[PDB]
Amino acid sequence: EEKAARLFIEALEKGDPELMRKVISPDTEMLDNGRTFTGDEVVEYVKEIQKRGEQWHLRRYTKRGNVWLFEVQVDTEQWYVIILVRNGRIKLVVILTNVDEEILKHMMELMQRNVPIEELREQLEKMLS
Ligand SMILES: [Cl-]
Ligand SMILES: [Cl-]
Ligand SMILES: [Cl-]
């Protein structure tokens, strides 16, 4: 479970779609500051990082329940990658940039309760406007 989560970040870190492909599933859902990605689209996200050449640096992390919060510096912006793992598999990912700690805590709470991606997205939208 820890490995799943960490490898996901390392894929971002390293710009490695091949690695991402290993730990996601067709059911994986991701929200990147509002926009939605399902399954193999998460892999394409990593291609965009690599085929752009800005460096993602995993700085530090926390586990809360089944939710991991990774604090990434992007070359600096504070990016946050929040991950719900379930059964060896990444279920939900939220990526945010330069948001308040309250938003991170609120999103983590929603994810802990296995809220659908629709609710996660609407909740973000209400908070960022
Ligand atoms: Cl999609
Ligand atoms: Cl809150
Ligand atoms: Cl809240």
Technique used by the depositors: X-ray
Say which residue the tokens 């994810």 belong to: 111
- The residue among 64, 67, 91, 68 whose CA lies nearest residue 10 is 68
Q: Residue ranges per domain, the chain?
A: 2-127
- The residue among 33, 29, 27, 45 whose CA lies nearest residue 123 is 33
Q: How many residues are given for the chain?
A: 129
Decide which of 1.10.10.10, 3.10.450.50, 3.40.50.300, 3.30.465.10 is the CATH code for 2-127: 3.10.450.50
**Cα distances (angstroms) measured from residue 30 to each of 76, 120:** 23, 10
DSSP single-letter state for residue 94: E
Helices (H), 1-127: 2-14, 17-23, 41-50, 101-112, 117-127
CA–centroid distance for 36 within its chain: 11
What's the gap in Å between 101 CA and the centre of ligand 3?
10
Resolution in Å, one decimal place: 2.0
Say which residue the tokens 């989560």 belong to: 5
> Angle of helix 41-50 relative to helix 2-14, nearest 10 degrees?
40
What's the gap in Å between 94 CA and the centre of ligand 1?
14
**Cα distances (angstroms) measured from residue 88 to each of 1, 22, 38, 53, 77:** 5, 11, 17, 30, 30
Pair 5, 83: CB distance under 8 Å: yes
What's the gap in Å between 36 CA and the centre of ligand 1?
5
> Which-ligand-closest: CA of 37?
1
- The residue among 14, 6, 19, 13 whose CA lies nearest residue 73 is 13
What's the gap in Å between 79 CA and the centre of ligand 1?
21
